[model samples]
Target: TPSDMPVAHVVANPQAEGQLQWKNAGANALLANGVELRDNQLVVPSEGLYLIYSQVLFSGQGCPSTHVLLTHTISRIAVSYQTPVNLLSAIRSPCQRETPEGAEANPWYEPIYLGGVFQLEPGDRLSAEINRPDYLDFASTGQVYFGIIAL
Candidate 1:
């Protein structure tokens, strides 16, 4: 049982460029068990059930009530599948009235979090993605992150 423990945590690098697909959340770590981080993805070390999660924070220079900030998604890439599959998603649409406006014109911040348990096999990889790469706030404060744990 001790060998089966698996977990990892990853954060977004403030200096890294954003894209439609998930990028390395800074340097990934095997914070708990034996899980591995490769190419910005959480790589499964053994076959079992896993709880996976991801969060993205979006901020911008302007806030528009009519505009959607972005769609944050958690996806899985496996050797058996032809493409990556979306496991969870969160969409943000903040009302302009709800945001504070001032000389600083407070940048609007929207956060999306998603998590769920799923069966996975060794070599399966988990990642996060955002629809609007430009809107993501890649602050070095660990606001954006990805994680997983074996159950």
Candidate 2:
């Protein structure tokens, strides 16, 4: 028999800080089965293989002369675990265009995507963190979203 495992899609709220916020679409939201939204973390319902994913859009006023390093990290915390574990981490330095000291520079936008398969147990919590929150463009659009599907 095929079981209806857990699956959820969460988005970031531009109003929040350090930790991201999820956009809830009333009752029939995708966050069902064994998955839950607690604070800024996603609590798992059962133990199994899950494909976790996240995408972040970074935008700034103007391109800096130096390179900008953007880091996207996914972490998990289990009840039986002593501390949180880092599941996936992606780092990238977007190319920047040099301009005259006083010349108006064009704004730049960079998108970072990270995903992987991992084993998890019930009570385990998952969350995505970004090093450069100032550059993050939080919107209701699907541009920046995080999700997990049981495999």
Candidate 3:
């Protein structure tokens, strides 16, 4: 139906200090090492299927590879949406380890696929989250990016 148009919202977070900085063009839109953005709220124009994509970048530091944590939430008060409302799909890029040929050292990330889906309506809620429980502490430095798209 024409009323079920889904809008994609992109948000970024750089959750590290003395390790990276956020390349902010507008609204701190991109997540780089040592920078972060959080608690981004969005309003849904309609309800339908959605694909959620997320990524985290690990900088080139001698200490160790740190993981970036990102959590996305969709809420509609009047509707009874379950937790992780609509988890259509997810991709996490692998960490950029070595420099490319004739190119500056740029970090990369592995892609993670979340094969699932959740239905939503006018008053429903949806969200996604990413966490690194391997070694990096809560205060560790890292970066993350996430968004949703109608499929």
Candidate 4:
């Protein structure tokens, strides 16, 4: 019976399709959107909230667009404009030729300092999406890289 306790395992289950699963006494859930759990790699830290971040990659003909939704009971807080305004929005604003390809290949290091914080509980959950709904469309051009960093 105790063996049935909540467990989080990160293994190769493509059938799960980029989804992470969590289990507890009588509860179970799955997380998707290109998310995977690794023994010492992907799982959430044992303690404290984390500021997550990642670098999304794109290939083929068109731009890869991903809309990620983060759901958590924890209060989500957005950080101030300590860094700089996201260039993607700027580049997309003009909507002109040449500028589309001009968009930065790597949009990770560019800081968009979120102005908020999300406090999470032990069983709290966070879900992410990559190239979802309409990731690759005619207008947008590239994959969306996203993650949280605990501060």
Evaluated at residue 9, the lDDT of candidate 2 is 80
5-122, model 1: which lDDT tens digit per residue?
A: 7877677765556553334344443455667667767788788988988788888765555566579878889878947898898788864453445645566788888989999888
Highest-scoring model, lDDT: 2
Clashing pairs in 1: 11-25
Compared with the true structure, model 4 gives a TM-score of: 0.28
Model 3: per-residue Cα lDDT over 8-27, one tens digit each: 43433335543212233345
Which of the predicted structures, 3 or 4, would earn the higher lDDT when compared with the native?
Answer: 3
Q: Indicate the residue-level lDDT of 115 in model 1.
A: 87
Tens-digit lDDT track for model 4 on 1-151? 1332222322211223343222211222233332334331233333355554322222223233342322211122123222222212111111112325657643221112122334433333343222222221111212222343334
Please give the range of 10 consecutive residues that has the lowest summed lDDT in model 1. 20-29
Candidate that beats the other on lDDT, 1 or 4, i.e. the better one: 1
Root-mean-square deviation of each candidate, in angstroms?
3.9, 3.0, 10.2, 12.9
Q: Which segments of model 3 are wrong by more than 4 Å?
A: 1-4, 15-43, 59-78, 81-118, 133-144
- TM-scores of all candidate predictions against the true structure: 0.78, 0.85, 0.41, 0.28
- Give the Å error, residue 94, model 4: 12
Task: Give me the overall lDDT of model 4.
Answer: 0.28
Single out the weakest 10-residue window by summed lDDT for candidate 3. Answer: 133-142
